[PDB]
Design a protein around this ligand. Structure first.
Ligand SMILES: O=S1(=O)NCN(CCF)c2ccc(Cl)cc21
Ligand SMILES: O=S1(=O)NCN(CCF)c2ccc(Cl)cc21
Ligand SMILES: N[C@@H](CCC(=O)O)C(=O)O
Ligand SMILES: N[C@@H](CCC(=O)O)C(=O)O
Ligand SMILES: [Cl-]
Ligand SMILES: [Cl-]
Ligand SMILES: [Cl-]
Ligand SMILES: [Cl-]
Lengths: 264, 263
């Protein structure tokens, strides 16, 4: 591409990055809208670089294959030099921190439980002590890896069930997880990040809800290849935007409740 | 060269670091107990170093003097080479990130309001729109800097009041702020971090409460001098302890497991 243009990898995930209405006649960065689109513009302005938004080719966040040790998703695009920076709801984790750099977090989240309203589930422990209600996670992301690695009794029990459930309880995109909750008449619960859970809970058809506390506490960070010359400036930009209140403003904008559910 | 004992700067702030019973006859790290004492041991174990806990001499978190440009507090101890690492409730901020290194956060917090129970205040906007109830912050910390720097109308209005209030609404320690809330019959509210607020809420005589939402969202990080080789390992240790659930267990141990205001 053009010299001096920073290649940004990101992922189609509402409300972080979405195709604009009429995107088919638009071009370049103007095709996209959302929290991370706005955040990319703010970061680029503070750091003084031109950039090109690119949607990750394989549509995945990033996991390392156990056999080949190859990273996929946005993490892989950073590791293997296909992108210069990831501006996306990319979760800070130990295994990723070992191979890429992360800014200080720009948004908080935790793993949470989505149910069809009325499902008799209040906690992860509730899910783990029964079998009528199936449950699963997104593939190739931090939630699945969390359960795989957990030595915490409840989560280890949940992983032992999910890894062997048939048909598979894992989904390829967040939208499939949500649809499965809505279609399963309350017999499927979806484990996903509270940010995406809370976004969906405010949207029509207003039939899902987040139940229980979050199962962990973490955040999204802007990611760069290890040793990138962008990392220091991007990190300071996140903290400056945070302290100016602009991250809160952006969250309020893209999670804005127009009252599709109740009074608003 | 040979391994050397790592000098840890920290601060006497409950329940992060507290004087143990019998401290008067104890030496070194055995004098202290608390969340950050436990966290220091965990970090040191994962990273494989020996360490000495040292309470910051001036008892301050860290601010830069506008005229001399000199840093005080724990930040100063790192900046001027007096300590190798800070393991404390030290808030990640832009101006500090410019001069020291921070791990990923080990605990989340936001600025919050502490009131004596029954005080007719529900929000920062409430405080800003009245004068009967005074309010202030800790000196030499991130909360005071937040109000001093804010462009948000309500917080700027609060700062304009606080900076000129007489007698001073600012306190030198959290304990002084708590005492002022408890003794002022509802005429003082204290702006402090939600972590400390929630801790005090569970201590006798159970006469304070946290009201309103948090005013911002940030976190504490383990800090090292800029470019310290210790930074990488300490950061991974924080994320590993987080993912193992040990930070959550430590929070429960020191905030709620032995809370004094019931279950
Ligand atoms: O100070 S920070 O590193 N970056 C700014 N934000 C706000 C964006 F999430 C947060 C939030 C939570 C924690 Cl624990 C830490 C931080
Ligand atoms: O993944 S992290 O950088 N470090 C671990 N924790 C948990 C301890 F605070 C958090 C919490 C909140 C945010 Cl935004 C980010 C993180
Ligand atoms: N944010 C996650 C993806 C969503 C999930 O795993 O629930 C990641 O970075 O992997
Ligand atoms: N944690 C704060 C001190 C407490 C406060 O300012 O309210 C700091 O690092 O400065
Ligand atoms: Cl369209
Ligand atoms: Cl030594
Ligand atoms: Cl003892
Ligand atoms: Cl408030």
């Amino acid at each position: 591409g053009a010299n001096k243009t920073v290649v940004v990898t990101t992922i189609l995930e509402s409300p972080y990055v979405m195709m604009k209405k009429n995107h088919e006649m638009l071009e370049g960065n103007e095709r996209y809208e959302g929290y991370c689109v706005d955040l990319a513009a703010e970061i680029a302005k503070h750091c003084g670089f031109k950039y090109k938004l690119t949607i990750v080719g394989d549509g995945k966040y990033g996991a390392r294959d156990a056999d080949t040790k190859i990273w996929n998703g946005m993490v892989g695009e950073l590791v293997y030099g296909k992108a210069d920076i990831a501006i996306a709801p990319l979760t800070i984790t130990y295994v990723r921190e070992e191979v890429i750099d992360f800014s200080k977090p720009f948004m908080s989240l935790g793993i949470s439980i989505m149910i069809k309203k009325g499902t008799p589930i209040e906690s992860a422990e509730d899910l783990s002590k029964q079998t009528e209600i199936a449950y699963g996670t997104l593939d190739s992301g931090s939630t699945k890896e969390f359960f795989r690695r957990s030595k915490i009794a409840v989560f280890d029990k949940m992983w032992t069930y999910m890894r062997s459930a048939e048909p598979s309880v894992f989904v390829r995109t967040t939208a499939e997880g949500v649809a499965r909750v809505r279609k399963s008449k309350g017999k499927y619960a979806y484990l996903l990040e509270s940010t995406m859970n809370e976004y969906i809970e405010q949207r029509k058809p207003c039939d899902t809800m987040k139940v229980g506390g979050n199962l962990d506490s973490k955040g999204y960070g802007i990611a760069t290849p290890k040793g990138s010359s962008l990392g220091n400036a991007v990190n300071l930009a996140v903290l400056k935007l945070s302290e100016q209140g602009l991250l809160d403003k952006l969250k309020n904008k893209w999670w804005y409740d127009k009252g599709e559910c109740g009074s608003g």
